[PDB]
Each structure stands twice: as C-alpha cells, then as structure tokens.
Amino acid sequence: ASGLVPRGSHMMEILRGSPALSAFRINKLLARFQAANLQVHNIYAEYVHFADLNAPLNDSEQAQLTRLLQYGPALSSHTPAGKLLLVTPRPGTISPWSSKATDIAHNCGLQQVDRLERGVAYYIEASTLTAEQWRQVAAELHDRMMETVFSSLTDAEKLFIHHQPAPVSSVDLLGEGRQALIDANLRLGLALAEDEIDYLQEAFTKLGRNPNDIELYMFAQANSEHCRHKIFNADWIIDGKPQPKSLFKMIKNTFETTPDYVLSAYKDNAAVMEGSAVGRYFADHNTGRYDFHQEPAHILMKVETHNHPTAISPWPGAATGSGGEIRDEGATGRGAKPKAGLVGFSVSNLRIPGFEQPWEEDFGKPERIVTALDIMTEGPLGGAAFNNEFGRPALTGYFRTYEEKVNSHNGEELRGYHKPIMLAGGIGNIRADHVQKGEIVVGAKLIVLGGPAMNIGLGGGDLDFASVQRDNPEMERRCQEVIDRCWQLGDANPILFIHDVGAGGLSNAMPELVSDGGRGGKFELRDILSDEPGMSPLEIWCNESQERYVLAVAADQLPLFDELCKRERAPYAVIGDATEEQHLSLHDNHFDNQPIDLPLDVLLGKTPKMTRDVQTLKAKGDALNRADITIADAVKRVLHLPTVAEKTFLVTIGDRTVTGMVARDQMVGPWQVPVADCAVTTASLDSYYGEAMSIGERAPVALLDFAASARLAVGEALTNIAATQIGDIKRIKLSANWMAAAGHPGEDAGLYDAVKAVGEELCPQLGLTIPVGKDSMSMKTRWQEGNEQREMTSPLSLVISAFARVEDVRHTLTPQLSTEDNALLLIDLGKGHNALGATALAQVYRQLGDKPADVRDVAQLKGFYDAMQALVAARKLLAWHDRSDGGLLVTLAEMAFAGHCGVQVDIAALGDDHLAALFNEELGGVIQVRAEDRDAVEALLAQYGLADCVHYLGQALAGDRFVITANDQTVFSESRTTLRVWWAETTWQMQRLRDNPQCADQEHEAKANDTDPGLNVKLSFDINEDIAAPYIATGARPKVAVLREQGVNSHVEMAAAFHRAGFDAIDVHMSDLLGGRIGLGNFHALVACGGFSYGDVLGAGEGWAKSILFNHRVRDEFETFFHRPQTLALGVCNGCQMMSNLRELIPGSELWPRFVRNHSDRFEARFSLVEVTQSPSLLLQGMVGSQMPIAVSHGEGRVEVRDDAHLAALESKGLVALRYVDNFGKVTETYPANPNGSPNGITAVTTENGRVTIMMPHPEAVFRTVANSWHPENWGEDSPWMRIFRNARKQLG
Ligand SMILES: Nc1ncnc2c1ncn2[C@@H]1O[C@H](COP(=O)(O)OP(=O)(O)O)[C@@H](O)[C@H]1O
Ligand SMILES: NC(=O)CC[C@H](N)C(=O)O
Ligand SMILES: [Mg+2]
Ligand SMILES: [Mg+2]
Ligand SMILES: [Mg+2]
Ligand SMILES: [Mg+2]
C-alpha cells in the first residue's frame, strides 16, 4: 500500500521492495561494524523504489507498477525496526538503474512514469551509539563518490527536482583585459598555458567580442594533453642533441616500413587489417531472414586506457573504459562490429587483509583515491559489467601488481601504480567498402545517436565528482544494433561518417566530424537530448556523458535512419547541418541567442609545437642479494605474486562465449585452468579462419632499462601468440599503449629511447607494423603523508597488444601437457644470459636487481616465430607455453597444472646458477612434442639458427610430482597439487572477499583434490548423425522466430544453429511484434535468445516478459502460440528467464521455478558439466543420459522454488531436463561445478507436453566443436549440442 505525495508539478510514489542483502553480506556488515568498535545489534536492508509521476495511475496501472517492482531473490522480509538510513544516488544524478527501469515502465504502457529511482533502506538497531558513531555507520553504508544518506524516505523527492536551464555566461575580455581570461582559466579549470591565453586573447580581440564560457571550455578540452597529444608530436633535444623525429613519427616508421595487409592506420580511432573471405551472417533488411554473405571480413583493432577516473571511482572508470573503446570500434569507417575484448590492470600492492605478503609495505596513499585492492575488487566488475551487458566476449588480459621503494633512474624512490593502468581493447570485423570514411555532402544531417545526456565528467575531472563516470551498456548495445543495420545495408549504408563521443563531449566530436569532411556546422542546442534540463550551454555541449556517437547522414536517408533507430529503440536526434562555410555555429532556441559563433580555423588553430629538452638518467643496477633466498622459498613467493598467480577472479566474471565465435579462451583443458597465452576467435560461424589477440608488457624492466622493457613487451606479445597458425610475421599488427610520468626525472628521455627502440629498430627489423596506439602521460600520484611530500611514480609502461588473421583456428596449441610419450624442449631466447634484474623473483624479495632481460638477438626472435609457425602448421606440437613473469619455473608449473600431471626435468645445461636458470624472464618458452618427433623438431629449430638456444629438459609424466634435477642433485621437488593450490591462493582470497565466501572456498578446495578427472563426456547418441538431413534435402525450410528484445545479444549464433538444422531463421524484435510487422501465427517454432534485456533491471527477463503481459494484444499472441498443438519453443538464458516470467501463458508450466541471483552473488561465465535427464522435452530426444560440457554465462541462473513442496512436485512430475554434475558425474550443488546454487543441479525444465523447454546454459554458443573451450580430440564439426536444433527440425516434419 504505497506512498504518493506532491513533488513539484509531479507526484512522487514510494513503493517498498524486497530485501536487499543476503545473509553473508549482512554478516560482513556486522563484522565491519564490530571491527570499528560500533556496537550494532542488527541490520536489515530493503530496496525502496521512487516513482515520479506526471499524471495519475488507475487501479489496473498501479497494480502493474507494483508488479514491475517485484523482483529478485525471495529473501525473508522483516518489519522495519531501529534507525532508518536511506542510501540513494546523489541529488543531481540519475542512476543507470533509473534509465533502464523507466524504459521498462514506458514499454509496459506507463507513460505517467516520468522517472523511477531506487534506494536501499537500512534499518539499524544500535541503541547505544553517539552522533559521531552514527556518522561512521552512515559512512560505512554508502559510496561517497556516487551516493547520499537520508533520514527519511520522503527525502528522495530531492532526486527529482526540476531545474530551469542555466544561461550562457560571457567572459569580459573587452571590459577587463587579459585578467578576465586569467580569472576564467582558474574559475572553470581550463588549465590553459600562457601561450593559449595569448591565442584566445588575440582571437577574441580580432573578433571584437567577448568569448562565452562554452567557447573557452571547448577550446581548453581540445587543447589538453589527453586530446592533443602534444608530447607525441613534440620536437626533442636529448643530452644536447636535437632529434629528427617526433614519437608519433617513430611509430609511423613501422607503417612506412611494413604497410603489408594494412587497410587503415592513423586516420580513424582504430586500425584495420585484411581478414578472410567468409560467410558474414545477418538478417536481410527486406526479408528479416538470416543469411550467410560470402565476403571479406576485415579486422579492426583498438586499445585504450581510463587511468585517471579509475583511481577515483573504479567501477564506472573501468566500465566506461570498455564502453568508450567499444564505441571507437563500432565507429570505425562507416560502421563496424565489435567482436571480442581484452582487459588490462596495473595496480599497487593488494595487501589483502589476513593475506599480506612479505614483500608488501604500506606506503600510504592520497585520501582522495581508492586503494589497489578496491580497484581490483570493483574495477574488474565494472569492465565485466560493460562487456557482459553490451555482449562481447572478453578473452585475454593482464594483471600486474607493483609498488616498491627502489633505486631507479632518479635514485631511491617509490615506484608503483596508485594511479592505475585500466586498459580496454578489442577486435572487430568490418566490410571492405566501409573501411574508408565517406565524404560529407553540404547539407548532410548531423546526428547524435545514443543516450540523453547529463552533466557527467565535465572536463575529464569538494569531492572530485567530475571524475566519477557512468555506464549504461544496454544503451550502447541498442546503438550498435543500429550501426549493424547500417553496415548490413552494404552499398545502401546511410552512414557517411561516424565517430565516438569521448573527451570534450560534443564540443570535440562535432567539430572533429565536420572538419574531417572539410565542412562547417550549424547546430541547435535544444535539439540535443537531455536528461538534465538545468544544464548550461557549456554543460550541454561539453559534458562527457556516455553511449553517444556522432554521425552524418544525407537528408533523404533520414526516414530510413529513423525506421532503423525506432525498431532498435535507439534514441537519436538530428542536431545540425553540415555547411560549405567552414564555420561553427551553435544556436539556442530557448534563450534566442548564439552560444558559439566561430570560424573553425580559430577554434581548431594550434599554438606552437612543444619542444622537450631533456637528459638521460640511467640507474646503476645492484646485484640481487640472495641472503634470504632459497629455491623452495622463491617458488612459494613467486606463486603468491598476483602478477604470476591464477587469474580466475578476472576471467569467470566475464562472458567468453557470446557470438559463438570463441575458439580459444583463457581457461584451458578439462580442469579449466586460466593459462591460455592468447585469444582466438573464428572469423565467422562457417569458417575455421579467424583472428588472434595477445598482450606483452614488462613495465618493471623500465626501472632499469627503458628500451629493454619496450623490446620485451613486443617480444612477449609474439611469444604469447606464437602457437597459433598465422604464417607470415607481417600478418601481426600491434597496438602500442604508452604509460609514463612525463616530466619525472629520466622518464622523458626513457620514453623517447623506448619509442625509438621499437619504432625505428625492432619492429621494422621484424616486419611488425604499429598501426594504432595511445598515450597516457601523467602516471604519478603525489600527496602529503604526515609532515612530508610523498610521491608514487609508475615505471614507463608500454603495453603491446598483438592482433593477427588466423589461417586455421583448429591448430592452436595451449599449455595443456599430454602424457603420451613426449619431450619437453626449452627454447631459451635469453642465450644463457639468465638475467634476474626486474623479475618477479627480485620483486618478491623487495629488490630490483642488476640487469634485466632483453631481446638478445633479433634474427633469432624472428627465427623462433617462423620455427613455431612451421611446427604449428605441420602439427608437430603437443603443447606450448611461453616464458614470462616467474620464469621457466612458472612456465613448467602452469603447463603441469593445465595437463594435471607431473614433470621430470633436468636443468644442468642451463648454467650453474639454478636460481637464475629457473627464474629469469628472458624470452622463449617450452614446447612439448611427441617423443618420436624430438630429433626432427630439434633439426627444424636448428634450421632457423636456434640450436644453441634449444635444450631438452625431460618429460611430462602422469601423477603429482614436480621434479627439477641437475644431474644427480634434486634442485626442487614438490607436489604439483601443492604448487597448484598455492598459485590459486590469490584468486581464492579475492573471491572470498568479493563474492560468497562459501563459493570461493568450495572452488578453492576442489583444486586440492588431485582425483578430479576433469571435464569428461558420455554420449547416448551418435554426435555425427545428422538426423535433420533428410528434411533439409527436401529444401522445405520451416521458419523459426528468433526472438529478441532490446539488450539481447546471442541471437545471431542462435539463428545460425537453427539454420544448420534446416530452418529459415527470422529476426523478430519485440518492436516487430508490437508494430504488426510479424505475427506468431505464421511460425511453428520460436526461440527466446540470451543477453541482458533492459540490463536485467527489475530482475533478469522480467521487463521483457512484463512488456508482453501488459500489452493485451501481444500477450494474446504469445498465449495463442503456446496453446497451439504442435508449436515448439525454446528459451535460452535471458530467454529462459523471460519465459519463466511468462508462464501464465504457457500450458503445462505450473511447476516451473524462478531464476534468481546466483548463490555466489557473482556473474558466472563457465564451461560446466551437465547431464541430460529424462523428461518430456522434445528438444532433448535421443540425448538422455548424455554428459557433456556446455557454455554458461549468467548472474541470475539459480533455480528458486516457493518451498520444498514445489521442488518435490516439479521433480515428481519429471520436468527437469538438465542438471549440473561434478566431474565425478554426480548431481551437484557444490560450486562452481554447479555455478549458480540451483537445487538438485536443475538448469533446464520442460512442460508437461514437452513442446516448450527453457534452459540457463547456451547450446547455441557451443554447437560448433571449434567453439568448445575443451573437447574430445575425435569430435568433428558438430558438438553434441547440435542435436537440440536437429531434434526441433525433425519434430516439425
Ligand atoms: N585482466 C585480465 N582479464 C582477463 N583475463 C586475464 C587478465 N589478466 C590475465 N588474464 C588471463 O589469465 C591468463 C594468465 O595471465 P598471465 O599469466 O598474465 O598471462 P601471460 O603470463 O601468458 O602473459 C591468460 O589467459 C590471460 O589472458
Ligand atoms: N547470457 C544471458 O542470457 C545472461 C542472462 C542474464 N543477463 C543473467 O546474467 O542472468
Ligand atoms: Mg603469466
Ligand atoms: Mg604467456
Ligand atoms: Mg604477460
Ligand atoms: Mg578420478
């Protein structure tokens, strides 16, 4: 019975929600209050919803709103008791939750809802607390950067205050002289240099009028280091000598040397290289049918960073890092399609409570930034939240910790990552005729595609609210869909030009766009979509609100554009027109004035180039002090370094299967151990051509040797990618992302030497192009600690990402050792240098050491690569794993973990210094070959000049022994399981602190049981028998409705699975049904696909389902469909959730459960073992008793019943169709074998008639054998799961 009060010209309603925190989270709050000496007896939390209404709700509408706001796990309600503390978003902000919840209310016919918002009501019983202690309690319950605490529910009215538009303000240069600019510079935080103030002074003096604030702000954002790249274009003088090239020209040298296969470099916000001719699969604009289009799928690539914002607010910082990079990809050329991501983090020491490591010292930090631990807790969740909700798989990455007091180039100082590296990148595909940006005709319409804006991130950043970003990935997915429809029109693609909206917001993006066409623009401020009516023109034009693009379309294509956008529900606005005159005009219809009126050459005019006159500093290395070092202690420590240690916390939080094109993800083999050295995707759903991505980075090396650190980043990118079938090294293309503390003594000369080392030397010599890259030049943090200045300065940190077209994805090797008769060979590209400076070993004993690794011999590096390519293509490798952090010791350990076996290796040939042989991080790695091939492989390597680098080590053996000898002496010997568990402790402790500790513990303890047989298969049918073939051979192809709501993302691969089984797959959007363009009476089959419809706001699948239920016409249509006597329907993942919420329309579904937040409280992207159980399901005919793995990617997959009576009834009806099993084959509730905590392992149910089946796993992700993370060697093209789609076809007849 809800509250409803006046709220300005509107009315606010208050709707109580469900309990907000599980028992473990409640207990964690209680323990934190107790650890803080706050005497709190109990705490209870409930969601509370606030609906700001523009008109009243009738009783039917009010019941609908109430039902929309019922979602989530059915935790036990408590009557409110104690003190209320309500936590909400800060006044003046609108949560993403709000944007999505409101969209659902509108799509359910509740136009009276102006806005919905959510808070958490905490009820705290703590009668003995003082006022100051209550403030400490409040501090504990909210994020000061994003949220506010209120003492009354009615205080939420504050979130919905209507503000009138703020006017433009002029800066009085004519009336005050230069002082007006000086004042404005400080007031608005423009950070203009003196010569910039000169430039602006003269420009406005010439125009004879005062600049407006907006014009000054625009200019200031455009001329920032972040936007202008002054350092990378500067002239240099080093140790008194003028240099001949800028940094950027040295990078371009690699393209001048090696243009091969490059289609686009340095003229877009991504590079493009040649791909392969394959079947690009999408729905025809006229028919709606999915069809393969044989044509080149070229490959785009991009990598960038979001370091500053992540130090302040890591979740949105990481999230919008991903988001911005995805926009760069989609805005490549005249439109393109992101396809897989990568992720990188560098932080200071974690100092996990209760798990502190011996090398870690708390050196303090600025009060205003978060800790390394907080970045590694919230930041990966943020990045993953964007990749998941947007729907691209995230398939490779790095994570480095570093924070130490070292004697480096500027003597003893603190070096680290208090300002982190937060890196996001990826690959996409693009059509050949869309690679080149088009011309912009005079009179083109200039559009903003995407989200209504707010005053976010203005200028890129008393709290620093301006550095707190905001992410709405489903908005970006809706925009990508439009982009996709555009490029899918081929020659009729209406996009003439497109670009990301990033730094400077529209103030940078729209001038950029018209200027890149040789045009001007005239714009109308009040045509831009806004969610913040109070904004000034400066705020409108300059804010860095997210999920926006700018594009130019011919006027005659507007009607087509509008159709495309409304079908996807992507907001857009025409905001201006391209002009012949090279002028920028922004008009304001509300204030009847002209906030901007400038010639473009004034606006975009440059001050002089920078000159950097700098000097070399070079650290003298100190030999490693080995006093406290033993080999055994060193192994234990190194395996405890986060950089080295298992990465599961960063991997399984992100989807790795959406698209159905993932051939090689991080997790390897039957034991799913995250050690894959590179990512591999197929180019299409009908090819074994593909793409690969790898990363190399070695920043600690730069504390000793700048150039060596850059050469090793390139080298390690190659050694990570080398056991994938590529061929010519010139196919490999690099992104070079440069992170430095420019100005810090020695770093500038170091930067130049490092750019020279790779751009002018190593890359040209190898034939590697760097066609893309970025720079971030303020990687240092300063603060006052007690009475003293403190500073934490990053090493020069180059990150290389390598990208390549792949000739045959099937031939990729992993670190999974075989125990067939074998040989382990080390390829030591260190040539016995065995350097220990700037290694993991040094780091874990708080040292830097003397001399680091380096590329020792350029010809031998190329030789290693070409040798590996020859071995891959000839199928002579059983496994490969490169040497990087932690040395040969860690390479061998990780191979043994992935093969769940032992090794017996001898290192006597590697030098007398066993510590250095085992722990150097020189380039190279370990190949495993069949024992019978040893001599031939050693001869092949010898051809490439490598004989002296090649060393036979020994063999992999069944069992649990990890043994390193030197002739007669045992150097090191341990249980492989003991090592594997130690290596897992970091991810264990991270999971434990972030997720349900019960789940974290179960996952960790499972690794200690060596008897685990790994994923394994039992098949009740012949996976090669195409039971649909006789039907397909008739040419009669039944339609399937491939149903998608906004935010759904696994529809293309779902279509292709049905297509292979003989269906004509039709793209049916929920907008198609709502608009009359499709009726389900024309179909015999329907599938509800996976994704994040409405970002799962109001419960996964809930908005989708309730939008059906609350439209009587569409509801009737679905009901009619399900009540027909022979129709078939399938719901997968989000579609499973949707159909579970739609069960009142589905006969025989009365016993179905709900699907809710996983027990782990975390998204689970796993390759899990299931068994097919006896049920009516017509889609699982022939498969009962089969056990095989399947892709799982969900956060809300836990079966929830009303009570045991309901579970028992469901079970006794026999409607359960799939169950999770552990690797021993038993039905399980233990995690992560059962990833979500479903009772009795339930993960699929069917109806009484078998005609409708719903399941949480994704059969469409894995119907192709090549897209199964691990599979039996003997499978052909089809996996077991292809049988589901074939059964559907045969059932139809
Ligand atoms: N930030 C991250 N996000 C996702 N995957 C990651 C991340 N860091 C590491 N990985 C994955 O974990 C595995 C081990 O990483 P790492 O040991 O850094 O690789 P390598 O030593 O081969 O360069 C690899 O498959 C890698 O792609
Ligand atoms: N891939 C999917 O369909 C995921 C479903 C939903 N977004 C969840 O996380 O539970
Ligand atoms: Mg590693
Ligand atoms: Mg590697
Ligand atoms: Mg690495
Ligand atoms: Mg066993």
PDB file of all heavy atoms in Angstrom, residues 851-866:
ATOM      1  N   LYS A 851      70.674  -6.327 -13.866  1.00  0.00           N
ATOM      2  CA  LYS A 851      70.434  -6.205 -15.324  1.00  0.00           C
ATOM      3  C   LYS A 851      69.212  -7.059 -15.668  1.00  0.00           C
ATOM      4  O   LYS A 851      69.151  -8.151 -15.249  1.00  0.00           O
ATOM      5  CB  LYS A 851      71.676  -6.688 -16.112  1.00  0.00           C
ATOM      6  CG  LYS A 851      72.886  -5.748 -15.894  1.00  0.00           C
ATOM      7  CD  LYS A 851      73.720  -5.656 -17.161  1.00  0.00           C
ATOM      8  CE  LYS A 851      75.065  -4.981 -16.899  1.00  0.00           C
ATOM      9  NZ  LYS A 851      76.173  -5.912 -17.313  1.00  0.00           N
ATOM     10  N   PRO A 852      68.273  -6.534 -16.426  1.00  0.00           N
ATOM     11  CA  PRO A 852      67.039  -7.234 -16.794  1.00  0.00           C
ATOM     12  C   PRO A 852      67.242  -8.042 -18.043  1.00  0.00           C
ATOM     13  O   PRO A 852      68.295  -8.012 -18.673  1.00  0.00           O
ATOM     14  CB  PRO A 852      66.096  -6.081 -17.064  1.00  0.00           C
ATOM     15  CG  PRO A 852      66.958  -5.109 -17.810  1.00  0.00           C
ATOM     16  CD  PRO A 852      68.271  -5.194 -17.018  1.00  0.00           C
ATOM     17  N   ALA A 853      66.230  -8.820 -18.398  1.00  0.00           N
ATOM     18  CA  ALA A 853      66.187  -9.446 -19.710  1.00  0.00           C
ATOM     19  C   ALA A 853      66.098  -8.407 -20.810  1.00  0.00           C
ATOM     20  O   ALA A 853      65.801  -7.198 -20.540  1.00  0.00           O
ATOM     21  CB  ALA A 853      64.978 -10.386 -19.799  1.00  0.00           C
ATOM     22  N   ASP A 854      66.246  -8.874 -22.043  1.00  0.00           N
ATOM     23  CA  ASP A 854      66.107  -8.055 -23.219  1.00  0.00           C
ATOM     24  C   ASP A 854      66.032  -8.964 -24.452  1.00  0.00           C
ATOM     25  O   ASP A 854      66.315 -10.109 -24.380  1.00  0.00           O
ATOM     26  CB  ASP A 854      67.326  -7.128 -23.324  1.00  0.00           C
ATOM     27  CG  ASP A 854      67.110  -5.867 -24.247  1.00  0.00           C
ATOM     28  OD1 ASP A 854      66.113  -5.742 -24.923  1.00  0.00           O
ATOM     29  OD2 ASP A 854      67.994  -5.022 -24.235  1.00  0.00           O
ATOM     30  N   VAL A 855      65.559  -8.420 -25.551  1.00  0.00           N
ATOM     31  CA  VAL A 855      65.676  -9.111 -26.823  1.00  0.00           C
ATOM     32  C   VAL A 855      67.194  -9.286 -27.122  1.00  0.00           C
ATOM     33  O   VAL A 855      67.866  -8.277 -27.355  1.00  0.00           O
ATOM     34  CB  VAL A 855      64.956  -8.377 -27.962  1.00  0.00           C
ATOM     35  CG1 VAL A 855      65.274  -9.020 -29.286  1.00  0.00           C
ATOM     36  CG2 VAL A 855      63.455  -8.451 -27.736  1.00  0.00           C
ATOM     37  N   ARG A 856      67.668 -10.484 -27.139  1.00  0.00           N
ATOM     38  CA  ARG A 856      69.101 -10.714 -27.246  1.00  0.00           C
ATOM     39  C   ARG A 856      69.568 -10.734 -28.701  1.00  0.00           C
ATOM     40  O   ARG A 856      70.759 -10.468 -29.005  1.00  0.00           O
ATOM     41  CB  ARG A 856      69.499 -12.010 -26.553  1.00  0.00           C
ATOM     42  CG  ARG A 856      69.153 -12.079 -25.045  1.00  0.00           C
ATOM     43  CD  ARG A 856      69.686 -10.887 -24.303  1.00  0.00           C
ATOM     44  NE  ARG A 856      69.436 -10.994 -22.853  1.00  0.00           N
ATOM     45  CZ  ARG A 856      69.978 -10.177 -21.916  1.00  0.00           C
ATOM     46  NH1 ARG A 856      70.843  -9.177 -22.299  1.00  0.00           N
ATOM     47  NH2 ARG A 856      69.708 -10.349 -20.632  1.00  0.00           N
ATOM     48  N   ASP A 857      68.705 -11.149 -29.593  1.00  0.00           N
ATOM     49  CA  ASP A 857      69.101 -11.378 -30.970  1.00  0.00           C
ATOM     50  C   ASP A 857      67.862 -11.317 -31.829  1.00  0.00           C
ATOM     51  O   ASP A 857      67.020 -12.147 -31.765  1.00  0.00           O
ATOM     52  CB  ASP A 857      69.746 -12.745 -31.032  1.00  0.00           C
ATOM     53  CG  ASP A 857      70.262 -13.147 -32.414  1.00  0.00           C
ATOM     54  OD1 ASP A 857      69.650 -12.900 -33.401  1.00  0.00           O
ATOM     55  OD2 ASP A 857      71.284 -13.789 -32.423  1.00  0.00           O
ATOM     56  N   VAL A 858      67.820 -10.302 -32.656  1.00  0.00           N
ATOM     57  CA  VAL A 858      66.612 -10.014 -33.453  1.00  0.00           C
ATOM     58  C   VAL A 858      66.316 -11.144 -34.436  1.00  0.00           C
ATOM     59  O   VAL A 858      65.174 -11.630 -34.524  1.00  0.00           O
ATOM     60  CB  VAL A 858      66.560  -8.607 -34.119  1.00  0.00           C
ATOM     61  CG1 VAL A 858      65.348  -8.453 -35.042  1.00  0.00           C
ATOM     62  CG2 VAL A 858      66.648  -7.526 -33.035  1.00  0.00           C
ATOM     63  N   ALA A 859      67.326 -11.535 -35.217  1.00  0.00           N
ATOM     64  CA  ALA A 859      67.169 -12.680 -36.165  1.00  0.00           C
ATOM     65  C   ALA A 859      66.653 -13.970 -35.462  1.00  0.00           C
ATOM     66  O   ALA A 859      65.768 -14.686 -35.975  1.00  0.00           O
ATOM     67  CB  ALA A 859      68.504 -12.962 -36.895  1.00  0.00           C
ATOM     68  N   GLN A 860      67.126 -14.236 -34.232  1.00  0.00           N
ATOM     69  CA  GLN A 860      66.699 -15.440 -33.503  1.00  0.00           C
ATOM     70  C   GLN A 860      65.243 -15.318 -33.020  1.00  0.00           C
ATOM     71  O   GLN A 860      64.600 -16.325 -32.963  1.00  0.00           O
ATOM     72  CB  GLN A 860      67.569 -15.809 -32.336  1.00  0.00           C
ATOM     73  CG  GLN A 860      68.936 -16.419 -32.835  1.00  0.00           C
ATOM     74  CD  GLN A 860      69.758 -16.952 -31.677  1.00  0.00           C
ATOM     75  OE1 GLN A 860      69.720 -16.432 -30.543  1.00  0.00           O
ATOM     76  NE2 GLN A 860      70.498 -18.014 -31.928  1.00  0.00           N
ATOM     77  N   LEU A 861      64.803 -14.104 -32.783  1.00  0.00           N
ATOM     78  CA  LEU A 861      63.387 -13.883 -32.370  1.00  0.00           C
ATOM     79  C   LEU A 861      62.494 -14.152 -33.551  1.00  0.00           C
ATOM     80  O   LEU A 861      61.480 -14.827 -33.436  1.00  0.00           O
ATOM     81  CB  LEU A 861      63.195 -12.495 -31.786  1.00  0.00           C
ATOM     82  CG  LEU A 861      61.779 -12.094 -31.352  1.00  0.00           C
ATOM     83  CD1 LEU A 861      61.164 -13.100 -30.400  1.00  0.00           C
ATOM     84  CD2 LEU A 861      61.832 -10.711 -30.782  1.00  0.00           C
ATOM     85  N   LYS A 862      62.875 -13.617 -34.707  1.00  0.00           N
ATOM     86  CA  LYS A 862      62.118 -13.888 -35.910  1.00  0.00           C
ATOM     87  C   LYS A 862      62.208 -15.384 -36.239  1.00  0.00           C
ATOM     88  O   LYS A 862      61.222 -15.996 -36.644  1.00  0.00           O
ATOM     89  CB  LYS A 862      62.553 -13.036 -37.125  1.00  0.00           C
ATOM     90  CG  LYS A 862      61.669 -13.423 -38.328  1.00  0.00           C
ATOM     91  CD  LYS A 862      61.340 -12.342 -39.309  1.00  0.00           C
ATOM     92  CE  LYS A 862      60.375 -12.872 -40.344  1.00  0.00           C
ATOM     93  NZ  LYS A 862      61.073 -13.861 -41.205  1.00  0.00           N
ATOM     94  N   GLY A 863      63.381 -15.989 -36.076  1.00  0.00           N
ATOM     95  CA  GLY A 863      63.566 -17.392 -36.313  1.00  0.00           C
ATOM     96  C   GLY A 863      62.682 -18.284 -35.441  1.00  0.00           C
ATOM     97  O   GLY A 863      62.050 -19.257 -35.914  1.00  0.00           O
ATOM     98  N   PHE A 864      62.603 -17.912 -34.173  1.00  0.00           N
ATOM     99  CA  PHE A 864      61.731 -18.621 -33.194  1.00  0.00           C
ATOM    100  C   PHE A 864      60.310 -18.544 -33.707  1.00  0.00           C
ATOM    101  O   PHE A 864      59.604 -19.586 -33.739  1.00  0.00           O
ATOM    102  CB  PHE A 864      61.788 -17.870 -31.864  1.00  0.00           C
ATOM    103  CG  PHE A 864      60.526 -18.081 -31.020  1.00  0.00           C
ATOM    104  CD1 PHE A 864      60.364 -19.207 -30.341  1.00  0.00           C
ATOM    105  CD2 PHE A 864      59.556 -17.093 -30.993  1.00  0.00           C
ATOM    106  CE1 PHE A 864      59.173 -19.444 -29.605  1.00  0.00           C
ATOM    107  CE2 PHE A 864      58.406 -17.314 -30.259  1.00  0.00           C
ATOM    108  CZ  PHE A 864      58.215 -18.459 -29.609  1.00  0.00           C
ATOM    109  N   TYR A 865      59.891 -17.356 -34.101  1.00  0.00           N
ATOM    110  CA  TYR A 865      58.475 -17.175 -34.583  1.00  0.00           C
ATOM    111  C   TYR A 865      58.217 -18.049 -35.819  1.00  0.00           C
ATOM    112  O   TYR A 865      57.261 -18.798 -35.889  1.00  0.00           O
ATOM    113  CB  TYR A 865      58.098 -15.722 -34.829  1.00  0.00           C
ATOM    114  CG  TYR A 865      56.755 -15.604 -35.552  1.00  0.00           C
ATOM    115  CD1 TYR A 865      55.579 -15.667 -34.845  1.00  0.00           C
ATOM    116  CD2 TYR A 865      56.711 -15.477 -36.919  1.00  0.00           C
ATOM    117  CE1 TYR A 865      54.373 -15.695 -35.499  1.00  0.00           C
ATOM    118  CE2 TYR A 865      55.503 -15.489 -37.603  1.00  0.00           C
ATOM    119  CZ  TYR A 865      54.330 -15.573 -36.850  1.00  0.00           C
ATOM    120  OH  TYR A 865      53.151 -15.545 -37.539  1.00  0.00           O
ATOM    121  N   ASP A 866      59.091 -17.948 -36.812  1.00  0.00           N
ATOM    122  CA  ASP A 866      58.908 -18.741 -38.044  1.00  0.00           C
ATOM    123  C   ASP A 866      59.021 -20.230 -37.776  1.00  0.00           C
ATOM    124  O   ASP A 866      58.268 -20.973 -38.379  1.00  0.00           O
ATOM    125  CB  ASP A 866      59.966 -18.340 -39.051  1.00  0.00           C
ATOM    126  CG  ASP A 866      59.794 -16.959 -39.574  1.00  0.00           C
ATOM    127  OD1 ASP A 866      58.737 -16.369 -39.506  1.00  0.00           O
ATOM    128  OD2 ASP A 866      60.813 -16.399 -40.118  1.00  0.00           O
TER     129      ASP A 866
END
